[PDB]
Amino acid sequence: LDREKFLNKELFLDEIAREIYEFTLSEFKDLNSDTNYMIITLVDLYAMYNKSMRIGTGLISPMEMREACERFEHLGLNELKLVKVNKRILCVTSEKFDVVKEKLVDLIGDNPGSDLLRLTQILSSNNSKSNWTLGILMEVLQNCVDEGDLLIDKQLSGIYYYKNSYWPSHI
């Protein structure tokens, strides 16, 4: 199919991008709802994209994974965007951050006191297709913690999260 047959570096990427955009979209959309999303930390994406698609087809430099995804908007692959959200979060999503932030928050507003080990299971199960990989979970969590969107309870036992309901911080 496509390894080192491509001479034009650019055209390669242009097509690599097309491949991923289709990979990810494959990895979720049920088309029974448009309430379904995907956030992936880029690193976690590169983990699987490569592992699954490109093993034996030719492998990818992260430098090229980053450059690839950076140009969806240009090739008119509009359902999925790549963005840096604070200093640290670098990820690809189907929706606004804020909109996905709020989603998680309110789920805790239903499942309060819960900690990651449980929040893992409950939210993202194996065959329950909500598409929260682990990596992006912690990254978002930590986020809403800073902006004051989510409240905490540290014990040795581990960290425990709650929803901000007595306190301020307007959208």
Binding site: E4, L42, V43, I60, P62, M63, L90, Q142
Partner: protein
């Protein structure tokens, strides 16, 4: 118009370098096509391109022969990712390069210099930070760096592996409370392992000890 002096070297030196890149890729494609399998020979050859000022990774581009060598460097980058996910419980998000070298990779012929590069590649995904301790490098998979307090603790855990409330009071000259308050912080966050059997105090251990011997 000043022709004679300056360009006598420019013209001459320019061709020296460019035409050498070809000589370079030759030794690599011809002889060190067994480079794909030698962690030392890499670090040798790559320390030249660095000196000239060449991305060695770029020399590999045109050839079938040399496009395995990249494919190794990525293979690795793909393992480092994986490592960091499996350990995230053990070490709480941070691993010594020590661990990476000797433990997880000694199994697949990979050397510290190789790794180091891989990690400089993954700077691309804006992912892990690095940080040094008493001078040794570490690799931070989690989403926030360690307070000034936290770092010092580790510095103290470099020698023995653990750190008492007393131990803090004694070496760095820390308080009683400031220490334990900021020391229990650490176990919430999975970084340190507690050990109660230790005596009057509990001691707080650093998963890294294990690795270095």
């Amino acid at each position: 118009v000043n022709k004679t002096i300056l360009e006598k070297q420019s013209v001459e030196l320019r061709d020296q370098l460019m035409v050498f890149q070809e000589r370079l890729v030759e030794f690599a494609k011809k002889h060190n096509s067994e480079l794909q399998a030698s962690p030392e020979f890499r670090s040798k050859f790559m320390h030249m391109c660095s000196s000239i000022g060449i991305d060695p990774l770029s020399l590999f581009d045109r050839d079938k022969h040399l496009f395995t060598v990249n494919d190794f460097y990525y293979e690795v980058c793909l393992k480092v990712i994986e490592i960091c996910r499996q350990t995230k419980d053990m070490n709480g998000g941070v691993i010594s390069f020590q661990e990476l070298e000797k433990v997880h990779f000694r199994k697949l012929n990979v050397g510290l210099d190789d790794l180091e590069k891989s990690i400089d590649m993954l700077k691309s995904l804006e992912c892990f930070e690095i940080f040094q301790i008493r001078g040794k490098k570490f690799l931070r998979s989690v989403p926030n760096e360690l307070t000034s307090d936290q770092t010092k603790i580790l510095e103290i855990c470099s020698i023995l592996g653990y750190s008492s409330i007393s131990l803090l009071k004694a070496n760095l000259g820390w308080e009683a409370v400031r220490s334990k308050s900021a020391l229990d912080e650490m176990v919430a966050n999975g970084l340190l392992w507690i050990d109660y059997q230790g005596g009057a105090e509990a001691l707080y251990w650093d998963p890294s000890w294990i690795t270095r011997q």
